């Protein structure tokens, strides 16, 4: 299936205390890989996947540096933006960041990305076409101008379709045994009465990847969309994820509702039921 | 691999 | 665009000679150039909006500054044989990596003794 | 560390010719290649930007390639004229040393003579 690239990058200002906090994390698909924080002794890019220490030093000191110049231009970046907005030198500010491909099964660019976000929401965004750029307001408008004289899109194009697809599936192939090994959920139902009438039914699903996943309740067949409550997929802390789904049943009429899971992982989605 | 760029707002 | 004074300066050794840019209107980072026979064009330091940023092998009896206005300055103190040079400058909008770098015409320095 | 090498050192020949010019340099770890021109009285002229991650640039009769991993970069000229006469200097933006200070490194040049 198609597969993708994700850089992220968050910058906190903390006025008086130093210099703002830099952590950025790399991602391919849903797996964590790379990892920088600047409160570290002595900064550097660390890895976090097996299949990502295979690469020399000259890879590892690449990295550090492209990290820490990240760090100082987030910096400035946040100084320019208080004059921007007129804003205070005392308050923190927040600065984020994220950029990356995915691609299709052939291995060729599905989609480009990299956009910016100041205070929690948008900033400004690479378009699609990898060409133009999405300003959020006036403030935005200034960075637009500033980066299409200096035809910053030119370079994130090149990279995008370049470097980017071409890395990506290099990593791909190296944990092939993990990264592309679908992790189908293992599933069960539980059950809790609540009251002598009424009763929870608890559809579970437990250690798959990737996280993307699907969990509905059916009662005779009809979907029970607006009956049903859902938890948001959450990491098991070993690279898989979990996730359940809840209904409030009849006591009696248990049998007559039905959970329907769909991952990729599965050859077909699975219809479970209560069954004490 | 990360992008090389410095691209200040 | 980028303008320099003077065009061309003539000096005994041991002497100062003060040299002078203005960069385009707009642009917050100054650079400055050493273009010698022996080696080549090579850079000497980087300001912007008055600040240092980036530093070659400059010597100690060299001092630059970029003033408010954006205009630079470029002393060179203690003169030697080996000072004789043209000594261009550039400037640039601010701290890109993905635009070029616009150079005046150039101070060709003679040094005598 | 980051230094630049150009060949030929000079370059003489006759107008229309199809015209190659190369440039290496030691460190891969570039934000950019350029191609400038240095005519005797006027400064520098900047005629090609090849960002980070492209491989090739183009402006009219100019066509230049990059190859970070090789090194390499080879200017090429189309149909010379004798107004392209002047000499040609690649350069390369980087980081010297720990540090965001990225400074312009320069090869010695290529002086072209076209004669008509």
């Known amino acids: 299936g198609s597969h993708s690239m994700r850089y992220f990058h968050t910058s906190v200002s903390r006025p008086g205390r130093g210099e703002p906090r830099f952590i950025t994390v790399g991602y391919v698909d849903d797996t964590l890989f790379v990892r920088f924080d600047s409160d570290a002794a002595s900064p550097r890019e660390e890895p976090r996947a097996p299949w990502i220490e295979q690469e020399g030093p000259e890879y590892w000191d690449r990295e550090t540096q492209i990290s820490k110049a990240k760090a100082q231009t987030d910096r400035e970046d946040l100084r320019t933006l208080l004059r921007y907005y007129n804003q205070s030198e005392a308050g923190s500010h927040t600065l984020q960041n994220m950029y990356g491909c995915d691609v299709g099964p052939d291995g060729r660019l599905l989609r480009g990305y990299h956009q910016d976000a100041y205070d929690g929401k948008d900033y400004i965004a690479l378009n699609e076409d990898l060409s133009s750029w999405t300003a959020a307001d006036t403030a935005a408008q200034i960075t637009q101008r500033k980066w299409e004289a200096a035809r910053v899109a030119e370079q994130l194009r090149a990279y995008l379709e370049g470097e980017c697809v071409e890395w990506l599936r290099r990593y791909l192939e190296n944990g092939k045994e993990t990264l592309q090994r679908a992790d189908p959920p293992k599933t069960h139902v539980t059950h809790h009465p609540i009251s002598d009438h009424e009763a929870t039914l608890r559809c579970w699903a437990l250690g798959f990847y990737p996280a993307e996943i699907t969990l509905t309740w059916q009662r005779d067949g009809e979907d029970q969309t607006q009956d049903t409550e859902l938890v948001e997929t959450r990491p098991a802390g070993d690279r898989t994820f979990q996730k359940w789904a809840a209904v409030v049943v009849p006591s009696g009429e248990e049998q007559r509702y039905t959970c329907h899971v769909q991952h990729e992982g599965l050859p077909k989605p699975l219809t479970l039921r209560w069954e004490p | 691999l990360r992008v090389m760029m410095l691209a200040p707002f | 665009g980028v303008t320099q004074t003077p065009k061309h300066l003539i000096t005994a050794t041991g002497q100062r000679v003060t040299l002078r840019c203005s960069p385009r209107?707009?642009?917050?980072?100054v650079y400055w150039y050493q273009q010698s026979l022996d080696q080549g064009l090579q850079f000497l330091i980087q300001?912007?909006?008055?600040?240092?940023?980036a530093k070659g092998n400059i010597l100690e009896r060299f001092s630059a500054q970029q003033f408010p206005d954006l205009h630079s300055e470029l002393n060179l103190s203690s003169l030697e044989l080996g000072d004789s040079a043209l000594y261009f400058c550039?400037?640039?909008?601010?701290?890109?990596?993905?635009?070029?770098?616009?150079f005046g015409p150039g101070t060709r320095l003679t040094v005598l003794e | 560390k980051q230094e630049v090498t150009q060949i030929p050192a000079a370059l003489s020949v006759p107008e229309g010719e199809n015209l190659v010019l190369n440039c290496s340099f030691t460190?891969?770890?570039?934000?950019?290649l350029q191609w400038f021109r240095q005519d005797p009285g006027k400064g520098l002229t900047s005629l090609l930007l090849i960002q980070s991650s492209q491989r090739e640039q183009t402006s009219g009769r100019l066509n230049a390639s990059l190859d970070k991993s090789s090194g390499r970069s080879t200017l090429y000229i189309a149909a010379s004229q004798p107004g392209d006469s002047a000499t040609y200097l690649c350069?390369?933006?980087?980081?010297?040393?720990?540090?965001?200070?990225?400074?312009?490194?320069f090869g010695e040049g290529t002086q072209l003579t076209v004669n008509p």
């Open positions: 350069a390369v933006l980087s980081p010297v040393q720990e540090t965001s200070g990225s400074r312009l490194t």
């Open positions: 460190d891969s770890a570039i934000y950019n």
């Open positions: 300001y912007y909006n008055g600040e240092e940023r």
């Open positions: 209107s707009g642009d917050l980072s």
């Open positions: 550039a400037s640039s909008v601010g701290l890109f990596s993905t635009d070029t770098q616009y």
